[PDB]
Design a protein around this ligand. Structure first.
Ligand SMILES: *[C@@H]1O[C@H](CO)[C@@H](O[C@@H]2O[C@H](CO)[C@@H](O[C@@H]3O[C@H](CO)[C@@H](O)[C@H](O)[C@@H]3O)[C@H](O)[C@H]2NC(C)=O)[C@H](O)[C@H]1NC(C)=O
Ligand SMILES: *[C@@H]1O[C@H](CO)[C@@H](O[C@@H]2O[C@H](CO)[C@@H](O[C@@H]3O[C@H](CO)[C@@H](O)[C@H](O)[C@@H]3O)[C@H](O)[C@H]2NC(C)=O)[C@H](O)[C@H]1NC(C)=O
Ligand SMILES: *[C@@H]1O[C@H](CO)[C@@H](O[C@@H]2O[C@H](CO)[C@@H](O[C@@H]3O[C@H](CO)[C@@H](O)[C@H](O)[C@@H]3O)[C@H](O)[C@H]2NC(C)=O)[C@H](O)[C@H]1NC(C)=O
Ligand SMILES: *[C@@H]1O[C@H](CO)[C@@H](O[C@@H]2O[C@H](CO)[C@@H](O[C@@H]3O[C@H](CO)[C@@H](O)[C@H](O)[C@@H]3O)[C@H](O)[C@H]2NC(C)=O)[C@H](O)[C@H]1NC(C)=O
Lengths: 52, 438, 438
């Protein structure tokens, strides 16, 4: 798992490598209100439901 | 000109400060934390290493008796056996058939290579932070090594800098620490003088050169077999060798906040947490008189493209009318967006471009070029790439502006409902006043 | 047989612990704290010593001019003067009358004897207590050196001793310390890189051998007098030498709880505060079986003379009946009175004598000889000497027993008042009952 904080992994003798994620999703912001909720649901899929 | 600020303790984050003196044109500094180092304070408890058992040759007394003598040696064991009849290759000596005696002796001592291969048991407390900050502004560009506590002032090009104490007091080392070569272990070791056989700390020494030694390995002697000379014994195997095979994990692969643990000295590096207050004291030669810098009027900020990604994925444009061409110091007064540059060349053409990185769907920030001001607002689309190998260049703020599409919809719906409720209130008030007037 | 106790942290106080194994005769130990040492943890900040101004010879240029050159020296100063016409014993050189220049130069440097006479500025935190205890019981003497924290076990004649952490966490050293030879001061010194001229810390060095130096002593050059070669200059006097005569007080003559401060290493010794928990583990050979111990019956305790003074100002007499003659252990089960001796010789004559020290007007305590018991009460008169040169040998308990003279008077008076109140309430209740039955 690679959260937005990122992570590092050590493989054999190689140097550790760090990988970071981006705030990417599947909805459409600046669309119909049934698409803005979709956008803010890929991000934080636990507080959007409560707020709605 | 005294100034104060607070800058994040994140390696590589391009912090820029805006200093706006009342009599001079504004200035923009750039500070960056190239490297950080967290140093604990250590008190050595003892040293452990593999033991080595010393077995002197037996003393077989022919036709007689021998007596054991006590000695002051670590884990000394001595016993006397009767009725022995040894043998050798050519014949059996001790002519007396059964009135013989063998004295078995053994004791333990620190190994030969304990000075090269040993583990130290420390107590770690009261960490001290130390950094290496790169400070650049105007025509100044230098890197300095600073102690991050409010008592080390370093002068960079005539300016005094005091980096205040770290905001938080979090350190990754427990009270007790066991160090081996280049690995640090969060472990609880037995007290000196009470180590148990077979586990870590079966033999303990206060220091690698210290003459005293506490050893407890359960060394026990046994009666030799008939017709042989061998001094048998049994002993619980080494504790340092059990420990090496069963220490488990480390701290190099377990520390929070992604900070590397290094040894000699013990130190945790690049460990992102907290904020670093900064105090300054600038001379009067850094600024420029407001008369000399250009005058900027009618500033409009328009956003070309936006994409809330990690790198600088937004392009900004400024239109203005200026009298003379020179230099300004751009800055963004909200942490929603972070510009890339701290200086722009203004020209009579009246058009400059800037790059910014943001992490919210609809940002709103106020940007200033020399003394002017402007409010920028834009709509940004998410990026497609799932994973990238560089850290975020924004402050990671997500709440959109009240003028964004989502919040515009919320405002409109709430306004409609509020108008309905106000109309109902008015109807009720009119009805009740008419009823009471009767 | 595991055991635990709590002993005062006062030097020389003869603590006696009483151990009562059910299958064996009681045992009495004696533990005395010969010496303590409160050892802080120190981090060096910088080193200050008197400075020494270096003035190279002037370079008088004849019929020409010279330019100033900048250099990286501590508090460096350089200037060029115009129109000098110097003179020497034989005459006046620089043939040109007016077109000559003289170049003045000076800078500061650390003194020659700075390695032998300097003041160190430290940070002190997290003191560590180390003690030297004398343990005597049965027939075993001996004095050991024990770290007073819950993880150092030392064995004295087969008995394992662990001296627990100190009750209090009080230290006489503030956060910041200045150490000079054999004197410690509680002082707040300027941060490195920001020392002010003329006071402590005008010049600072990170270590005795460190090459870097920071100097701020207001060195300022002046124009040479006409017809002279001297390089005049002015400079604010040394701040270290000023500090020497106006440091004020110390900590050796200022510390609380009467503990002497020493140096190399910095430590505060014999400093009476708190309590020291003690854990034990005794072998079976330390005790004597109850069958071997003499049997004591009908124990009665009488006090001949008493005087609540610092030394042992009481004499105690015990009468009993025994079957055999041997050794008993004597202990007092209350801290109001402390017995001088821990064992006594029981004889068929049926009389032993003891010495005790008390600090209350009327003490009451129970004393045991081997397994017997007896309750002792006495009336003690105050002493006559106003001042003595030795410490107190009692536990400083003043409240008398409820059976004392003063408490007897209080009890009698309160009993009379209670009888009166009870009679009143009885009369009122009788009258109320008669009235209600009407
Ligand atoms: C040469 O061989 C003879 C073998 O008989 C050795 O004679 C032995 O000498 C030892 C001297 O200590 C005798 O030991 C003693 O035995 C008595 C009785 O058991 C005991 O009470 C003493 O405390 C002591 O242990 C031993 O008995 C004796 N052997 C006999 C008499 O048969 C002789 O010592 C040898 N000479 C050498 C090795 O130079
Ligand atoms: C302010 O001064 C620092 C140095 O005091 C400048 O750091 C410079 O950083 C660049 C890249 O960030 C370095 O160039 C690199 O050189 C390596 C050599 O192998 C090359 O592989 C890289 O691709 C890159 O070209 C440069 O060496 C370094 N200068 C030094 C160390 O003296 C910094 O750039 C200065 N600020 C500005 C705005 O220029
Ligand atoms: C011997 O003594 C004579 C005495 O005059 C020295 O002559 C002087 O030389 C200096 C250096 O060349 C002259 O200074 C120059 O002045 C002109 C202005 O006239 C200026 O433009 C130059 O830049 C330079 O500063 C100086 O004028 C001249 N004396 C006179 C009266 O003109 C000579 O240098 C001495 N020689 C030695 C080897 O000491
Ligand atoms: C356990 O060991 C200590 C130290 O060896 C014993 O303390 C010592 O006690 C003897 C007397 O029993 C002291 O000798 C005399 O001391 C007086 C003191 O005024 C002096 O005037 C005499 O000239 C003579 O030296 C000795 O000084 C003393 N040592 C110390 C360091 O205090 C202790 O008595 C031993 N335990 C037992 C049960 O004996």
């Amino acid at each position: 798992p690679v959260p937005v904080d990122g992570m590092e992994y050590h493989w054999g003798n190689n140097d550790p490598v760090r990988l970071w994620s981006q705030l990417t999703t599947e909805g459409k912001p600046h669309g119909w209100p049934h698409q803005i909720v979709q956008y803010y649901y890929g991000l934080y899929p636990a507080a959007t439901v409560s707020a709605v | 000109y005294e100034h104060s600020t607070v800058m994040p303790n994140v390696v590589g984050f391009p912090y820029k400060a805006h200093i706006e003196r009342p009599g001079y044109s504004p200035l923009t500094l750039q500070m960056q934390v190239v490297e950080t180092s967290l140093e604990p304070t250590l008190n050595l408890e003892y040293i452990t290493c593999e033991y080595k058992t010393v077995v002197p040759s037996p003393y077989v007394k022919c036709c007689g008796a021998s007596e054991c003598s006590t000695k002051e040696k670590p884990d000394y064991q001595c016993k006397v056996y009767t009725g022995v009849y040894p043998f050798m290759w050519g014949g059996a000596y001790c002519f007396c058939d059964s009135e013989n005696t063998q004295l078995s002796e053994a004791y333990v001592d620190r190994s030969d290579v304990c000075r090269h291969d040993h583990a130290s048991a420390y107590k770690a407390h009261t960490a001290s932070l130390k950094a290496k900050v790169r400070v650049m502004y105007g025509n100044v560009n230098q890197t300095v090594d600073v102690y991050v506590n409010g008592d080390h002032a370093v002068t960079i090009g005539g300016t005094q800098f005091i980096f205040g104490p770290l905001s938080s007091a979090w350190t990754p080392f427990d009270n007790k620490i066991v160090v081996y070569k280049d690995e640090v272990f969060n472990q609880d070791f037995p007290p000196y003088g009470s180590g148990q056989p077979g586990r870590f700390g079966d033999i303990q020494s206060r220091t690698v050169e210290s003459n005293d030694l506490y050893a407890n390995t359960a060394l026990k002697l046994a009666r030799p077999s008939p017709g042989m000379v061998h001094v048998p014994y049994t002993q619980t195997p080494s504790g340092f060798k059990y420990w090496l095979k069963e220490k488990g994990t480390a701290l190099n692969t377990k520390a929070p906040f992604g900070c590397q643990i290094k040894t000699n000295p013990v130190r945790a590096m690049n460990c992102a947490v907290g904020n670093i207050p900064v105090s300054m004291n600038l001379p009067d030669s850094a600024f420029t008189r407001i008369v000399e810098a250009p005058t900027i009027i009618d500033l409009t900020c328009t956003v070309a493209t936006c994409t809330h990604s990690s790198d600088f994925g937004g392009v900004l444009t400024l239109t203005y009318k200026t009298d003379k061409n020179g230099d300004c110091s751009v800055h963004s007064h909200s942490n929603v967006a972070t510009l890339q540059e701290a200086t722009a060349k203004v020209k009579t053409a009246g058009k400059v471009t800037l790059h910014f990185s943001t992490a919210s769907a609809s940002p709103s920030f106020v940007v200033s070029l020399c003394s002017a001001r402007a409010t920028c607002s834009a709509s940004c689309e998410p990026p497609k790439d799932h994973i990238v190998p560089y850290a975020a260049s924004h402050s990671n703020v997500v709440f959109p502006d009240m003028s964004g599409t989502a919040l515009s919809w919320v405002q409109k719906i709430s306004g409609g409902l509020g108008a309905f409720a106000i109309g109902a209130i008015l109807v009720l008030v009119v009805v009740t006043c008419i009823g009471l007037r009767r």
